[PDB]
Amino acid sequence: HMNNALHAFVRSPHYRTIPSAGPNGIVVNRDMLVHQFRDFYKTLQHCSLVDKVHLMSERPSVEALRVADQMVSIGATFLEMPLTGMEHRATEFMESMRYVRGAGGPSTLASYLQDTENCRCNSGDVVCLPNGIAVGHGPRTNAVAHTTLKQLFEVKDSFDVFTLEQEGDAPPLGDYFGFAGSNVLLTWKDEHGLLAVDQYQQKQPHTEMNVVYLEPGCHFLSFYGDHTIDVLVQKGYERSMDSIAAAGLNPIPVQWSEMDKLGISMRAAVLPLKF
């Protein structure tokens, strides 16, 4: 066991402003929610995924829990997202950057995507792979972003940038499509994961991939980068947990019902910074 130098920033929920119901109308239990987040923070603390967990101060909007939206880390680059859809979150991202700097992190973030005209990109649509990234193309991440990410990182000699075309109702790619261990592909069993898997296996047909089919809705957390086998799995998805352990991985159950109902994946609630 060795320390991966990965730092995870999260923001605790503001109890007073937790909505009573999620975007679809299902009931949300704020007492359960703050319970689950404290347990989630403690789970991140003792596992192989991250090294150090940093808690950030409360803000009066449940959107501020989506700390992953601010940036994505590709290699040693901390790539800022364009603010075209989230101008109202500038002051939040700001405050988050003070926590990053205070922990010994970067002084600034790379502004390539912010300096590129008409570039739309969502951090969840970028998924880190063995020697490259898979980027979803669809309702959040447009083709300029794919063009820009390729010139930023693609190396044909190798670092691949796979474009995976998404349907209009696809969630961010990383919510249902991920990597674990050395060569394990994690994907949801719905139209979105199955399409992404069909596309990715054609673009990379040379290294055979162990595809693990999770149940649709099974929130999971695993970022490739030591090939640790720890994968956070939403508590309640029994068969998914079986599928993950059937592939030599370590499924770690996390109670996530209330953040699930809020529309916030575990991935969205953790800002992982590859120091």
Residue numbers in the entry: 6 to 162, 166 to 233, 235 to 284
How did the manuscript describe this experimental structure?
Kinetoplastid protists such as Trypanosoma brucei undergo an unusual process of mitochondrial uridine (U) insertion and deletion editing termed kinetoplastid RNA editing (kRNA editing). However, gRNA directed, processive editing requires the RNA editing substrate binding complex (RESC), which is comprised of 6 core proteins, RESC1-RESC6. RESC5 is a key core component in forming the foundation of the RESC complex. Similar knockdown studies revealed essential roles for RESC5 (formerly called MRB11870) in kRNA editing; cells depleted of RESC5 exhibited 80–90% decrease in edited mRNAs and 2–4 fold increases in pre-edited mRNAs.
We describe here the 1.95 Å structure of the T. brucei RESC5 protein, which represents the first report of an RESC protein structure. Size exclusion chromatography (SEC) studies revealed a clear, single peak for the purified RESC5 protein with an estimated molecular weight (MW) of 30 kDa, consistent with a monomeric form of the protein (which has a predicted MW of 32 kDa). There are two RESC5 subunits in the crystallographic asymmetric unit (ASU). The two monomers in the ASU superimpose with a root mean square deviation of 0.6 Å for 274 Cα atoms indicating they adopt the same structure. The only differences are in two surface exposed loops (residues 18–34 and 159–167), which appear flexible. The RESC5 structure is composed of one domain and harbors a propeller-like fold comprised of 13 β-strands and 10 helices. In the structure there are five similar modular “blades” with each containing a two or three-stranded β-sheet packed against an α-helix. DALI searches revealed the RESC5 structure shows the most significant structural similarity to proteins belonging to the superfamily of arginine-glycine amidotransferases (3.75.10.10), with the strongest homology to dimethylarginine dimethylaminohydrolases (DDAH) of this superfamily. Examination of the superimposition of RESC5 onto DDAH revealed that the catalytic cysteine and histidine are not conserved in RESC5 and are replaced by alanine and proline residues, respectively. Interestingly, the largest patch corresponds to the location of the active site in DDAH enzymes suggesting this pocket might be involved in RNA binding.
